[PDB]
Each structure stands twice: as C-alpha cells, then as structure tokens.
Design a protein around this ligand. Structure first.
Ligand SMILES: *Cc1c(COP(=O)(O)O)cnc(C)c1O
Ligand SMILES: *Cc1c(COP(=O)(O)O)cnc(C)c1O
Lengths: 148, 401, 401, 144
C-alpha cells in the first residue's frame, strides 16, 4: 500500500486541525502553525518522486501523485520545497485522502481552509504551488473513470 | 542637472505611495507622471488629420513620436537616428539579430560564444539558431570574481568563432564584465558582438561608438517607460546586411505575386502598425530622464544597496552574490527557502522578487536553484533599507527553527 | 431586448469632440473611457504584491489580466482559452504561422494559394516563406462581384496545395468572401487555412468552431483597444504542432548549454515580458464591447455608409468599390486625385484616409493606383454623413476642371 | 523646361497671392499654378529621384551648368502639391549652391502668405522635396 506514509486524513483530521487553528486571530501565529504542520509531512524519497507529477514553478517546486485502492478510495502523496506551501498542502491532503472520486468531485476541498480560517494564507501562496496541486488533484480525480 | 536631489526625483512617481517599499525595479520600473500623462493623452485623442479643440496637445504627441529615435540615439551616443530600430523588447531585439544576421551566414561547425551569466533572452535564440544552422554554442565561464572571464576569451576563440553573445550587466549579480576588452578580442577574430543591455541601459547606458558595439538591445519598461516596446541598435552596415524580419506593410516598397522589394533600415525591420503608444511613452520617459545625471542617480542607488548588504550581513547565515557594489542585491539565508521569504516580506509591505530570474545556467554555476533579489532605484530611500532589514528579522524569526 | 442606442455608445469616447468627423476607423479605432482608464491606472500603480492604499484598483487590474484570454475566447466562441496567443498585431500573428507552421513542412514545389484581396500582412509572409522553402504562391482571383472567387477554388487546388491564405473582410471593399465554403474545399484537399480577421473581428467576429477555422488573427487597435497588441487563435493540435517562435524567458521550461525544452502552447509561443499594458487594455475593450449587440451596432454603421454612397452617387464621375453594403466605403471621382481630396476634406473637418491601403495587388486588379476610403463606426451619426457629402461638394468645386 | 524662376518670378507670384485672404481661394490659385508645370516624360523621370510616399508620388532632379547655377526639375501626382512644388521651384532655380544654403526657400511661402497650405501638405511630399534640395545642394560643392 504505502511507504513513508502521512498522517493527514487518518490521524490528523478536520477536527484536529480545527482545534489548532480556530483560536488563532493574529496572522503571524497562523503562519507559524502552518509551518509546524508541514513538519509532519515526511520527506518523500526519490523513488516516490519518480511516480509523482513534478510541477516545477518559477517560485517553488511541488510534487503530487496518487494511487487508488480496490475500495475506490484514493491515496494522495506529495511534497513542497517551500515550508508555508508544505503546511497548506498538508491541509489539502486532510480534505482529500481516503475519499473516492465521486465524493471528491462533489465536495470542494477549499471549504476546509474557510473552516480553519486560512483563506488569506491560501490566497497569498496560490501561484507558489497551491493552484497547481489543486488542479493536479482534479486531473487525477478525472482519470478514475478509466479501467472501468 | 546641477546636483541630484533624490526627493525631487521621488516626487514624480504617482505609484510610490501605494507601492510601499518597492525593491523590484530590475524586473520592471515604476513610471513618472510624464509617461502616464503622454499615454493618457495619446489614447484620449484622435490620430487623424482633424483636430477641432486640442491641436496643441496633438502637435506635442507628434513631436514626441518623431523625435523618439533621436532621443534613444542621444542616450547611446549613436551617430545617427536611423541606426535605431523599434521592437517589442530586448527578447525580440536579440531574436532578430540571430535570425536576420546570423542564420543566413552561419555554416555547419561555426561557433557562438555565450557567457554563462546571460539572461535566457541572450541564450535561447542562439541555441535555436545553432540547431537550425548546424552551428554550436560554446560557453564563456565566470572568473573568481563571478564575472564572465574575458581574459579567457582568446583561448575560447577558434577560427570557427563568429558571434559573441555577452551581457552588459547581469540581472542577478549586477556585475558588468570588461566589455571594452571583450569587444577588442572579438573584433580581432572577425566576430560580431551582441550586447544585452536590458539592465545596463538603465544604470550605465553604453556609449556605442566609444565601445564600438555591433548590436545593442534594451527594454522600455526597465527604463521607466511603457511595456511592449524595446530597442535594437545596430551599426548601419549591419542593419543593411540583415534580412527582413517580419513581412507585411510599411517594410515593403513594392509588392506583387511574383515578389517584393523592401525599404531600407530601420523600416525594413519594422513590419505592421507600430506600437505608437510605446514609442511615444518611451520618448516621454527619455525626455524626462535627460534632466538627471545618471552617474549621480546610480551612485545613490548603489549607496542604498551597500547599506542594505552591510546591515543584512550582520545576520548569520547570510550570503550575497552582488558584484562591483551594484544597485542589484541578490542574496539568500542558510536553511530558508526563498519563496517563503518573499511571501512574508510581501506581508510586511516589502515588494521583492524570488526565483531563477531567467538565468538557470548562472545559478547552477553559483550552486543554487534560486535566489531573492532586492533591486534599488533612485526613487528609493534609506527608510526603505531600514524597512527591508526590519522585515527580514521578523521573517527569519518565523522561519528559522 | 438590448436595443442598441447609438448616442449611449457615442458618449463613451472622449476623443470624439476633438476628432471632428472621424471616418478612419478601419485604419485605427477610437478608444472608450474604459480602455483609457485601465491604462492610466496600470501605469499609475506598482505591479508588486504590496499595495498600501489602492488595493481595490490593483485587484481589478489583476482580474482583467487573468481573464483576458477568456474574453477573447468568448468573442470568437473558442472552446478553450489556451487556444489564444498574444502577439504584437495581425502582422506578427500571420508571420508566426508562416514560420512556425509552414516553413518546417513546405517542400520545393508546394503551393500556397493567396487571394488578390489580401492585405500585405497576409501576402508578404507567404512570399518570404516561399523563397525560403522553394514553394510557390498561387493567386486566387476576384469574381465579378469583386470578392475572392471561392467557386474557382477547386480548379486552383492541385495535389501540391498546402495552405490557403484568405481574408475574412477586405480593408478596401469591406467585402467578405464565402469563408465557410472556402474552408470546406481547403479541408477536403488536406490544406490548412490562415484567416486574416483584422477587419472581420471588428464587424463580424468569426465563430471559429462553427466555421472550423484553423488559424485566425486580429489587432487590438482596430477593436477599440490599445496599440502593440494582437491575437493569434489556433486549434490546439496546430499550436502543439508549431515550432517555438521567439526564444527566451517564459517560453522555456529547462535550459542548459546542451539544449532546452519549452512550455506548452500558448506560452511556448510567447517569449519575454508580455505587453501587459496591451493585454489589460484589450481586456478592458472586450469587457466593454460585450455590453452591445455587435449585429445591431454593425447594422447602424452600415446604414450610414449606405446613405453616404447613395448621396455621393448623385455627383457625376463618382465610383464606389464597396461590397455587400459594408461599413467601409472606398471610392473616387473621375479626374480628381485622391491625395488632393483628402487634404481639402481635412480642412473642412472630415478625417479620412487615401492611398493604397497596404493592398497593391487588389488596386491593380481594380485598375487604380489608389483610393479614398471612408469607414463608418457605431460612434458615427447621420450628421457625419451630411458633413461628408457637403465637404465633397466644396472640394469638387475647387478641384474640378 | 518650366517657366518657374525665369518667366514666373517671386514678384509675379506676389502680385497673385498677396491680395488673397480666404484660404479657399489660395488653394484654387495653387492648383492653377500647378497646371503651368509640364507633365515630365519617362526619360527625365529616370534621372530624377522618386520619392514615393504612401499618400502621393513626387519626383525631383537637378543639373548644374558651368556657371554654377542649378537647374531643378520635378513632378507630383497630387495637384495641390504640384502647385507648392511650382512655388518651391521659383525660389531655387538658376541659383548657385552658395546662394541656396544662404537663404531658406521657405521664406518665399511666408512672402506669399502660404504657410498654412505648406504645413497642411508637408507629409504629402513637401518635406521630401525640401530635404532633397538640401541634399542636392550639398553634393554640388564638387565632391564632399
Ligand atoms: C490593419 C490590417 C492588418 C495589419 O494589422 P497590424 O495591426 O498593422 O499588424 C492586416 N489585415 C487587414 C485586413 C488589416 O485591415
Ligand atoms: C529583463 C531582461 C531581458 C528581457 O527583456 P524583455 O523586455 O522581457 O524582453 C533580457 N536581458 C536582461 C539582462 C534582462 O534583465
């Protein structure tokens, strides 16, 4: 199934994130907590980078890949060089992950950033890799019509 | 231009209040009111024969357009205004030389020497033409001072060397190689020199006659002017030797289905309706710029860059790539990703650029994948330096483990 | 339901009072305040991430820039915004197709069919590529109605025919050939069609999917927009098949001294810093234009042209070259030189154009060396027609016999 | 040849144009003046410089006698520009290069009260002709 794994969607849930981010009003503290959240995303090895899509931006390099279980549940994995984007990816992975393609196309992952009160931060880093990751997930979710 | 006053200079830019602390002029320059006002007037009036009310304003715009070449020539100390050609930008200017001068002349095996400090604009076109002609690109490396190693040039020159692509000023290090000497070596070998002056034109505008430059290119937007407009200077013999660039109206003299004849340069190289807004706006920029001593204005810009570097150097993990005390300050901090820093500096009101700066080979040579870059213009102040330094501290405290 | 009001339309153009009687829109169009205001705001603000005062205005400009492609797509009923490419004008757009699509594919003896009604922009590039590849340009002549003889096309098409260069609308006659049929014939022969829409985009914007157009080009300045900006539409397969155009930043993906890889289209075809002012301004034009039913606005323009023609036809020695009751009215008067008339009409407050209109072969086919041209836009009135007619009478009395 | 400079002089032009205040009448008289300039054959067009504008085609050529006096010849397709050329030829014909560089031909248009008309047709050929005369007068020193 997996190697380095990641806790997002399983161990780290929407509830867990909400306890952490809900009481934060000062923008500086929100970024601190995003950076810290990103430390929980492991370093993805070279072999797993080979089977992920590399979205090399001018600003920042980002990786995203997927696998689908017989269940129909999708496992997502990825990485970022930028630490603020790495935290945001972590939030993104919590929203998806272990969810089927039908479930995914019917929910917007962006709703989680609202619940956590992170829209300003998301917005500030969209072109530094978040756009790319989000659309890569949409592209990956569309590929799960095939093999019927 | 009796004594340069930074405050007087500053006052002319309406963007400056909203812009906060703007340190990204090497990407694109802010515009003085003279440029903004000429552009609005141009688009607010007819370009026709009839002017019912605003004839004076219309005469002024015509005057600006017709003098636009001369004003560029004065900036470059060019002998005559017919040696100036309008392009989109430096990128187009260089592509033109590669395709209209080089391509019909290069034979298989011929060699194009290009410095590792070159912007993509002065590298990719040579790679393209090399593939098309069977020629080869040869690298001119950096010396210990991080400038293109001009003293190595005689060794790299062979009997098959034809072109030298060389930047007047790097957009990363701000470093200027010994261009005068470079040209002497190239000309001894019967080579032609393409000089990328996108940055150099703004800070140390090249005297093309004194330096004996064959081709020289820059962009209007870096020169406090409009977007979508650039210049190619060429020696007249070389412009006459060039093939036509784009085909169409204005550049042609006579056309039939059996063939066509062209105008002389520079019109030979300028097909279609010109970007009249760009030319007029660039003219407005040059006329205005002519009031200030660039040498003094550049000294000011450099003073601020030096204060910035010395202050930041007190923070541990700091590294600078800046050469010759230039107004461009490329840097980074150990263990801190440049993208993260740019985001946070923005939030503190400091407008900066990160990334590769269209200069991958240079950064590979320097052993980095990207950098932060603060670039200082004469509309900046010492308060700007303090704000930068303060913002970095706050940024570092959030990012350092 | 959206009843077109010419007065409302008129009110938007600040140039109109000073412009007098402006009948030269086919050369260049006047600009609505929306375009003038977006441009001034763009040059009046920083392009960075920091905005201290005027964030709302900055957010508006960003919005305009990012939607710009989509808005061009909506105008052309294009399936996807990635099929739109930015150029400096129709002339560049056409040259790109010639060099990036045609040149690497054409073999000696291959044939390029070009209509006699073509603007130099859609003729000279084919002549140039023909010389470069050993291909030949074949003429598609006019029929009795002075339109490109599309019914003759099957007879001109041979097994060596590859490209069909055809204008959507002539800038002299205002005539539109049967483009739908033309394309069917070309595609049956496995040819690709280059459509020059510099005039057509303004009056009858082409539905590229319905018509099945391969390539389509137009200019922003004719479309009530900025100078120095143009569009190339292409089918995505064709844009993918094209070679890179200019070399430099943005278009490249990875670069080393051993070679380079490029982005996908449209970025593959867009090297260097883009003319951001042009794109933003053109977006402003399109957003604004989208409020009016072009069909109604064009009908109005044509109504005025018809009144003009019928009135001038009462004067003896009059001849019109106008087709399909278009908004463009080319004409002349027996024994009266067109240059003289233009000068005098100017003096009477009427601004129009004389000359060859970058269409030498067409005029030769029509048996004249030049013509007067009055072109009507939706910001013109019936008073304008009367003033034209009256001015001509006065002019004729000074010039006749 | 042509009568300008010999039989049509600055004096004779001044009698004609001086009493004219209405701009319409000034143009009429320029057009009429242009009829006095003969059409110019193909052979003489070959030895003249062709200044083919977008608007209007214009020709200008010169010869020098042993006197040092310069003979000028030319043509225009546009009839208003043809009248203005006729005025220009009156100013500069039969005059030496030293004389020419020492007085401006434009001074005659002021004396005749035709600066508005000259201005209106500058880009229709008058610029070109005026500068072609200056270029021709610079060649006539003998060599550079
Ligand atoms: C004006 C025009 C062109 C050329 O457009 P530019 O913007 O000058 O490149 C091409 N074709 C037609 C029919 C035109 O009217
Ligand atoms: C910006 C720049 C260019 C390219 O200029 P454009 O206006 O984007 O074509 C080329 N060389 C250098 C050194 C630059 O800084």
């Amino acid at each position: 199934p997996q190697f380095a794994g990641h806790p997002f969607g399983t161990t780290v849930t929407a509830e867990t994130l909400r306890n952490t981010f809900a009481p934060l009003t000062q923008w500086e503290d929100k970024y601190r907590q995003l950076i810290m959240l990103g430390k929980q995303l492991p370093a993805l090895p070279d072999e797993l980078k080979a089977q992920a899509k590399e979205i090399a931006g001018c600003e920042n390099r980002v990786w995203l890949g997927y696998t689908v279980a017989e269940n129909g549940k999708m496992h997502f994995f990825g990485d970022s060089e930028g630490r603020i984007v790495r935290g945001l990816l972590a939030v993104l992975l919590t929203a998806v992950e272990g969810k089927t393609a039908a479930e995914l196309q019917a929910q917007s992952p962006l709703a989680l950033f609202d619940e956590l009160g992170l829209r300003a931060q998301l917005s500030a880093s969209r072109s530094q890799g978040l756009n790319a990751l989000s659309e890569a997930i949409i592209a990956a979710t569309k590929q799960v019509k095939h093999h019927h | 231009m009796n004594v340069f006053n930074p405050a007087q200079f500053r006052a002319q830019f309406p963007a400056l209040q909203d812009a906060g602390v703007y340190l990204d002029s090497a990407a694109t320059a802010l515009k003085p009111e003279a440029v903004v006002e000429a552009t609005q007037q141009f688009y607010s009036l007819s370009a026709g024969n009839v002017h019912r009310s605003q004839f004076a304003e219309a005469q002024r715009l015509t005057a600006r357009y017709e003098a636009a070449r001369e004003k560029v020539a004065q900036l470059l100390n060019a002998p005559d205004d017919k040696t100036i050609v309008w392009t989109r930008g430096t990128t187009e200017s260089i592509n033109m030389v590669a395709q209209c001068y080089a391509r019909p002349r290069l034979q298989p095996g011929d060699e194009i020497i290009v410095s590792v400090a070159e912007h993509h604009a002065n590298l990719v076109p040579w790679l393209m033409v090399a593939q098309q002609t069977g020629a080869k690109v040869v690298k001119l490396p950096l010396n210990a001072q991080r400038l293109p190693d001009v003293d190595l040039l005689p060794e790299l020159i062979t009997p098959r060397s034809r072109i030298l692509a060389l930047g007047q000023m790097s957009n990363v290090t701000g470093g200027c190689p010994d261009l005068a000497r470079a040209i002497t070596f190239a000309h001894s070998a019967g080579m032609v020199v393409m000089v990328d002056g996108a940055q150099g034109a703004v800070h140390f505008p090249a005297d093309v006659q004194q330096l004996d430059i064959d081709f020289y290119a820059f962009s209007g937007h870096k020169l406090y002017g409009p977007t979508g407009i650039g210049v190619l200077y060429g020696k007249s013999e070389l412009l006459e030797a060039m093939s036509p660039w784009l085909g169409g109206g204005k550049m042609v003299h006579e056309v039939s289905f059996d063939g066509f004849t062209t105008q002389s340069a520079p019109w030979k190289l300028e097909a279609g309706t010109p970007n009249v807004a760009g030319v007029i706006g660039l003219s407005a920029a040059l006329e205005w710029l002519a009031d200030y001593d660039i040498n003094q204005a550049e000294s000011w810009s450099r003073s601020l860059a030096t204060l910035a570097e010395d202050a930041l150097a007190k923070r541990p993990g700091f590294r600078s790539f800046r050469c010759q005390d230039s107004s461009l300050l490329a840097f980074d901090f150990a263990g801190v990703h440049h993208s993260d820093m740019v985001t946070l500096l923005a939030e503190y009101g400091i407008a900066l650029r990160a990334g590769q700066h269209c200069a991958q080979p240079l950064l590979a040579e320097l052993g980095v994948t990207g950098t932060l870059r603060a670039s200082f213009a004469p509309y900046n102040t010492k308060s700007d330096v303090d704000a930068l330094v303060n913002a970095v501290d706050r940024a570092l405290e959030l990012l350092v483990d």
